[PDB]
Structures are given as structure tokens and as C-alpha cells.
Design a protein around this ligand. Sequence first.
Ligand SMILES: Cc1cc2c(cc1C)N(C[C@H](O)[C@H](O)[C@H](O)COP(=O)(O)O)c1[nH]c(=O)[nH]c(=O)c1N2
Ligand SMILES: O=C(CCNC(=O)c1ccc(OC(F)(F)F)cc1)N[C@@H]1CCCc2ccccc21
Ligand SMILES: O=C(O)c1cc(=O)[nH]c(=O)[nH]1
Ligand SMILES: [Cl-]
Ligand SMILES: [Cl-]
Length: 355
Amino acid sequence: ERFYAEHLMPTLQGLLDPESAHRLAVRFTSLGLLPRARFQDSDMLEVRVLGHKFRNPVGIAAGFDKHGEAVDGLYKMGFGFVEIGSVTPKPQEGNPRPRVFRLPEDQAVINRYGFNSHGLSVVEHRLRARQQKQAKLTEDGLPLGVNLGKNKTSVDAAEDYAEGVRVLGPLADYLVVNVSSPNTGKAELRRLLTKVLQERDGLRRVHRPAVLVKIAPDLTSQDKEDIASVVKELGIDGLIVTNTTVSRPAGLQGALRSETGGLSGKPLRDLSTQTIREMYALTQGRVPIIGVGGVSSGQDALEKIRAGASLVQLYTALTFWGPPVVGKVKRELEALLKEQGFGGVTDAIGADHRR
Ligand SMILES: Cc1cc2c(cc1C)N(C[C@H](O)[C@H](O)[C@H](O)COP(=O)(O)O)c1[nH]c(=O)[nH]c(=O)c1N2
Ligand SMILES: O=C(CCNC(=O)c1ccc(OC(F)(F)F)cc1)N[C@@H]1CCCc2ccccc21
Ligand SMILES: O=C(O)c1cc(=O)[nH]c(=O)[nH]1
Ligand SMILES: [Cl-]
Ligand SMILES: [Cl-]
């Protein structure tokens, strides 16, 4: 933990640009070249939501394993669920390089990858190669999410997402549609999600995933009200809150703070927590939320859970602190739940709203 945080990760940081580090991290993870996480998950961390058991509530957010190459290595790291993607219908290269920037002084990253994606067919075949292994993992409390994007040149965003539902829906425990990358009307949102849900409902029952909407933290109050209304009206299964921010909070120190793209990590944390809090209230606590943005400790995770998240994800912290951060978050969260009088994660979900 301290070796990765203080010695290993800062050293490798000096030699590689951030995208090269990302590529190497995916390769090492896919090869299982990481010690199998030692933390054995307490019963206190189990969460039942979205039609599944989650052995622990700490997932890897989309954008780490964009193309479904490292799923098993991510479970080995101790994540209670894995989200791959975003995956676009056709392969596409994304934006020109450089397109990922570290802000070490802020424990933040700015990225403008632009949905670089191997495309649905490649990812489909990759997931098919381990489909029954995943079924067993899911039954054992380790579900798989697939985040669906759209191609840069698409003339019909809803059809891109519908294609993703059809192709990867059958391989996913849940699907995600962003209504939120920074790098690509209410009735239109309703139209898009109606089409997505119709396609999902058309899949055979054992292949029918939950559908979540992933939002940015940069929405207006009107946008959030509208999203909550549409989600309730259509029966969307959950929300992922949040994607990266195109805002630049006051106080960023990194030299690269004015690069275009989505900001992640610590400066996003509380903006994300507050968005969770608002979306939980606007949905009357009836819509599961996966909380994400700036989680690097048990306290960060519990703040999102108490604000309304049933599950959390992290990404940027993994890239600064390495794999040990996963067990750290889980151990700290367990300890804080005990300290605060909760029987388990489930009892803490939304607890701030009942104060
Ligand atoms: C380099 C990089 C790349 C991506 C992302 C992030 C980063 C840093 N994120 C967003 C990610 O899933 C998450 O929502 C935010 O990064 C906030 O979480 P952290 O602060 O990183 O824990 C992201 N989200 C998404 O829905 N699809 C994607 O393809 C990506 N790609
Ligand atoms: O650069 C950072 C923050 C600081 N960390 C490193 O520079 C770094 C270097 C080597 C490393 O070891 C590995 F074996 F080479 F991977 C792991 C991390 N984050 C990037 C950008 C976003 C995506 C991503 C994904 C994985 C790793 C880094 C990053
Ligand atoms: O591919 C990207 O640029 C990307 C997508 C997304 O949803 N979020 C993000 O921060 N980057
Ligand atoms: Cl299938
Ligand atoms: Cl706390």
C-alpha cells in the first residue's frame, strides 16, 4: 500500500506518459501480473441491487478497460464489479495524442480520449470467450457492466446505443448509456431511452441486463430534474453519478489544468457526491445509484453511499495509488460502517437523507 503509493507508482510515473501508463496497466492487469488481492470481503460489504448480488460495493469505473481486455484481472484486484467501455458500434481511434494528462498536485487527471474503441464486434467476441466464466462470477457476486458509447460520425445516436444493447446486452449484467462524456431536449432523452429500453426488453430473459444512465456533474438543475423525471417515467434501472467534469474547480494547481477534457480524481469528488445527493432526492431514493468521482478512501466511499449510492466506482485513484487502493477503500469502509453504527453497506445507503 505505502510501497505503491510512495515508491512504486511515483517512480513509474516519471518514465511514462499517462496514456502509455494506461496501456501498460491494462496489459499487466489482463495478464494477472498483480498479487491476488488479500482482503477477503466481509458480509457487511455485500449489496443486493440491480437484480444482482455484489460481494463488495467497490467497482472499477468505465474507461480503464475500454475494450474488455482485463476483466478477470480487475476482479483479481478485488473489485466487486467491473464496468468495461465505453464501447462504440464501429471501431474508432478517438482523439489525437496527447489526450490524457496527469495533474499530480491535484490528484487528478484530465482526459480527452474521445471514445477510442475496438468496437462492438471485437468486444462481443472477447466477452463471448469468457461468457460462462462471467456467468459464474456474476452468480458468485461479481457482476459485469458494459458502458455503451456512440461513434463520432453517427447520424442517429439512439441507433448506436440500440446496436450496443443488441450486441453486448446479452453479455452484460448491466448496460450504461452516458447522457455524459465531455469528449464527443427532455423529449429527446425520453425518445432515446425508450428505444434503449425497448431493445433491452426484446432480449431473452437470461440475457436481459439492467439499464443505467450515466450523467455528468455539469448538468443544470433543470437537466437533473428532467433526467430524474424521465428515469422514473420509463423505469430506468439506475443512474451512474458521475462522469468527469468539464468544469475546472477553483484551486487546481497542475500545470495542465487548462487542457481540454474531463477532469477526474479528487477535485471532482464532492461535486459528484452532491450530484448523487440531488439525484437520490429527485428519484425519492427508489432508483439505484452507482456513485463515482474522486473516491480514494473508505470515507470517500461512505460519503457517496450515505448520499444515496448503493455502489461506488473508482478509477483515477487506482492510477495514482495502484491496486492496493482497492483493499484500502474496502477495509476503511468496513471500519467506518462499524464506527457509525451501520450493520452493513445496505443500512447506510441514503442515510444522510433520513437525518
Ligand atoms: C482516462 C479516463 C477515461 C475514461 C473515464 C475516466 C478517465 C479518467 N471515464 C470516467 C470514469 O468512468 C469516471 O466516471 C470518472 O473518471 C470519475 O471517477 P474517478 O474520479 O476517476 O474515480 C469514462 N467514463 C465512461 O463512461 N466511459 C469512458 O469511456 C470513460 N473513459
Ligand atoms: O498517469 C496517471 C496518474 C499517475 N500514475 C502513473 O503515471 C502510472 C505510471 C505507471 C504505472 O504502472 C503501470 F504498470 F505502468 F501501469 C501506473 C501508473 N494516470 C493515467 C491516466 C489515466 C488512465 C491511466 C490508467 C492506468 C494507469 C495510469 C493512467
Ligand atoms: O473516451 C473519453 O474521452 C471519455 C469518455 C467518457 O465518458 N468520459 C471521459 O472522461 N472520457
Ligand atoms: Cl448471447
Ligand atoms: Cl465518513
